[PDB]
Design a protein around this ligand. Structure first.
Ligand SMILES: OC[C@H](Cc1ccc(F)cc1)Nc1ncnc2[nH]ccc12
Ligand SMILES: [Cl-]
Length: 167
């Protein structure tokens, strides 16, 4: 039993809800919130910009130190950093950004990072401003993640479309 509320169950382990991931994280304070990161951990827009804003830029400050020490992430890769006021940990995961010409096959590799954590609150990787098809992202999520994932989503119209088309 966990404290996630109001989710629709898609499979044994995948759940989905129309929700603002920032507000969800503040309410639940999950062990792990997933950020839709880029390789530079520059949290400008989309989910990343919103999560970072909610931390009063502390996420960005921590991220800049991480990059200065370690260099950029790989597309498809991840790192674990603090969750600040939102969660215990933030798993920064880099899905491919179609608006940059990155290979969509890397979306499965990106979701594989979720399997290192028993329970996660997460967005659909590569969706939104990353330019991939969200129906595809949900399919890859369901077919790749084996741990318990609670997907938030932002766009109410999109949420209804995702549920109705789910196979
Ligand atoms: O896949 C991640 C989605 C992409 C998206 C956004 C808007 C649309 F109209 C259609 C797709 N973004 C978010 N999901 C959950 N919580 C969020 N908080 C702030 C942004 C955000
Ligand atoms: Cl987005």
């Amino acid at each position: 039993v966990n404290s996630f509320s109001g989710y629709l169950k898609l499979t044994d382990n995948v759940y989905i809800k129309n929700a603002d991931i920032v507000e969800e994280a503040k309410k639940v304070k999950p062990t792990v919130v997933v950020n839709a990161a880029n390789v530079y951990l520059k949290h400008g827009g989309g989910v990343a910009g919103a999560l970072n804003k909610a931390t009063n830029n502390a996420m960005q400050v921590e991220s800049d130190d991480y990059i200065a020490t370690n260099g950029p992430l790989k597309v498809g890769g991840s790192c674990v950093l603090s969750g600040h006021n939102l969660a215990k940990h933030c798993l920064h995961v880099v899905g491919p950004n179609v608006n940059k010409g990155e290979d969509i096959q890397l979306l499965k590799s990106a979701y594989e990072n979720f399997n290192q954590h028993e329970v996660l609150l997460a967005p659909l990787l590569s969706a939104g401003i990353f330019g991939a098809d969200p129906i595809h992202s949900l399919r890859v999520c369901v077919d790749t993640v084996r741990t318990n994932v609670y997907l938030a989503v932002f766009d109410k119209n999109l949420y209804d479309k995702l549920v109705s088309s789910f196979l």
